[PDB]
Structure 1
């Protein structure tokens, strides 16, 4: 796995991407690593924000599936044409896979100026593949066509005219022990669609938010490398911000800061980290009534952004924000942690990342077990629509 270490790059807040080739001869593209979706789709026509794109007609190994695909997210949408081609990851396993590729022909609010990526690698399960769950996702094909074990793991690492470069590692087919310290702890995948998990408790500097735990997973809780923020359901967000405000209250920031839409600054080197609390999410353990906590620092959730104007200051954006589609454990959370996507055993592992950003007094932590007698059910059950209900799955 030494050859897959540091195989991710990107810009702070605009996605981690891995180099991939599609086609014969191979066409190199930079592809967003995204565990919140299940499609492999690449830019396939010119776009203001794209340096380059997939040219189907130039690949002798392309096959057109003669079928269209459309995916709107809450933010971002793309469509294109389905097909298959030969795909490899140069800084990945030494294999070539024939995979489904969606060749994006239109899009809105999908590509990001300056991000340097030209498509997306959805690494979540077939159930949220578009246009339906019969479109085999990339990782499924990789595992079916090769010897690669059904597991990958992500080490995302944190960090004046451009945003900060970031770096990471996607270890395809296992677990590199140099990327974490201490214990690896697993939380069960509730269901194989998103990487859906259950949060059973939240503390801010050790104070329990004391909400009904279903609130934390309303309407789900997912791990998503392709989301920058820790995003929280309305009610949890509001309680969380009220608590972080209270701890930090020696500093009186603008509304726009807490809305994640404005920077706040201190003289270089003088940021009063100590006034911002740590946040602990307790995740369901593998054993009934057990849980473990992951503890992130303000270093993770206060995101560095250099000011052109006050480039002499350390400035930060608030990278916790509100959600209407459940808790999203985004790059904020993930940057604390080496995260193991153990599809084979239907679980997700967390250990303290060997590259997480911390200080002299606090570290990001993964700690357990913690026990609960008569642990209620903290899962939410999403209302089933007639659309969803009507689909057959043969």
Structure 2
């Protein structure tokens, strides 16, 4: 898997993207790797924020599906024309796949100025593909047309006139043991739409937040590489911030800091890491009543930004934010861990990332098992609307 190692790039907080070619002749595009979605889609017309885009009509292998598509996120929104074409990853498997592609023709708050990506690779399941689950997602097609094992793994590596470059690896088709240390612990995928998982317990510096564990997973908990922050449901976010405020309280930051909207700085090299607590999420084990914990440092949740105007300082952004659609384990979480999307056995593994940022006193950790007698159910059941209910699945 050496040729796939380090095949991701980007700018800190703006998404990791992989290089892909679409069409014949091949057009190269930098594509956001996003496990929080299931569409493959590329900018397909000019845009202030795009250097380039996919030109359907310059590809001899393009087939129009004569079908339109619309995907609204909440923070985002794009639409386009559905088609298929030949697709490959230069720093991936040595294969070419015919896959569905959405040619994006209009968008809003989707593309990111400076991010250097021109599309999105949705690696989640067909259930959340648009317009429906009959649109075969990229990964399904790849596994189905080639011999590629039904598994991929992600190692995202965290970091004056530009934001910091990041590097990552997406290993398509297996697990590169050089990308982690220690044990790989697996949590069941609750349902196959998002990479939904179940958190059973949260600790801030050893201290249990003591909430009904259902609050952790309200209304779901997902692993999303295409989300920058660790995002937490309102109740959970407030309790977590309270505890972090409290451990870090020899330092009094502005509201805007905790709201993720403002940098705080120290003299270069003098950041008092150790006044910031570790955060541990306990995840449901493969064995009933078992859990393991993934433990991140302030080096994951405190995100470096070089101030143009105080460039002599180390400055940081708080990259834990509030959610109203559940817990999102975003890059902040992922950048502690080598994460294994084991679709074949319907599970997600975490191990300590050989590239995670740490210090001489603490590291990100993956630890288990932990055991609960008569463990309750921490899963939430999303209310079923009539729209959703009325859909057939043939």
Deviation track 1:5-40 (CA, whole Å, cap 9, x = no partner) reads: 000000000000000000000000000000000000
Corresponding residue number in structure 2 for 1:390: 390
Q: Using the TM superposition, give the Cα deviation of residue 136 of structure 1 relative to its aligned residue in structure 2, in angstroms.
A: 0.0
Q: Using the TM superposition, give the Cα deviation of residue 340 of structure 1 relative to its aligned residue in structure 2, in angstroms.
A: 0.0
Q: TM-score, normalised by structure 1?
A: 1.00
Q: Secondary structure at the match of 1:149?
A: coil
Q: Using the TM superposition, give the Cα deviation of residue 339 of structure 1 relative to its aligned residue in structure 2, in angstroms.
A: 0.1
Deviation track 1:30-86 (CA, whole Å, cap 9, x = no partner) reads: 000000000000000000000000000000000000000000001000000000000
Q: Using the TM superposition, give the Cα deviation of residue 337 of structure 1 relative to its aligned residue in structure 2, in angstroms.
A: 0.1
Q: Using the TM superposition, give the Cα deviation of residue 159 of structure 1 relative to its aligned residue in structure 2, in angstroms.
A: 1.2
Deviation track 1:81-111 (CA, whole Å, cap 9, x = no partner) reads: 0000000000000000000000000000000
Q: Secondary structure at the match of 2:115?
A: coil
Deviation track 1:300-325 (CA, whole Å, cap 9, x = no partner) reads: 00000000000000000000000000
Corresponding residue number in structure 2 for 1:169: 169
| Counterpart-to-counterpart distance in 1, 2:159 and 2:139 | 29
Q: Using the TM superposition, give the Cα deviation of residue 296 of structure 1 relative to its aligned residue in structure 2, in angstroms.
A: 0.1
Q: Secondary structure at the match of 1:3?
A: coil
| Counterpart-to-counterpart distance in 2, 1:326 and 1:142 | 30
Q: Secondary structure at the match of 1:153?
A: strand
| Counterpart-to-counterpart distance in 2, 1:386 and 1:129 | 19
| Counterpart-to-counterpart distance in 1, 2:289 and 2:361 | 31
Corresponding residue number in structure 2 for 1:356: 356
CA RMSD after TM alignment: 0.2
| Counterpart-to-counterpart distance in 2, 1:12 and 1:393 | 40
Deviation track 1:193-245 (CA, whole Å, cap 9, x = no partner) reads: 00000000000000000000000000000000000000000000000000000
| Counterpart-to-counterpart distance in 1, 2:309 and 2:371 | 50
| Counterpart-to-counterpart distance in 2, 1:30 and 1:275 | 38
Deviation track 1:169-192 (CA, whole Å, cap 9, x = no partner) reads: 000000000000000000000000
Corresponding residue number in structure 2 for 1:224: 224
Q: Secondary structure at the match of 1:235?
A: helix
Corresponding residue number in structure 2 for 1:15: 15
Corresponding residue number in structure 2 for 1:268: 268
Deviation track 1:115-154 (CA, whole Å, cap 9, x = no partner) reads: 0000000000000000000000000000000000000000
User: Runs of 4 or more off by more than 6 Å in structure 1?
Assistant: none
Q: Using the TM superposition, give the Cα deviation of residue 160 of structure 1 relative to its aligned residue in structure 2, in angstroms.
A: 0.6
Corresponding residue number in structure 2 for 1:331: 331
| Counterpart-to-counterpart distance in 2, 1:121 and 1:48 | 21
Q: Using the TM superposition, give the Cα deviation of residue 374 of structure 1 relative to its aligned residue in structure 2, in angstroms.
A: 0.3
| Counterpart-to-counterpart distance in 1, 2:215 and 2:3 | 42
Corresponding residue number in structure 1 for 2:345: 345
| Counterpart-to-counterpart distance in 2, 1:48 and 1:299 | 33
Corresponding residue number in structure 2 for 1:28: 28
| Counterpart-to-counterpart distance in 2, 1:363 and 1:73 | 34
1:212-291 paired onto structure 2 within 5 Å: 212-291=212-291
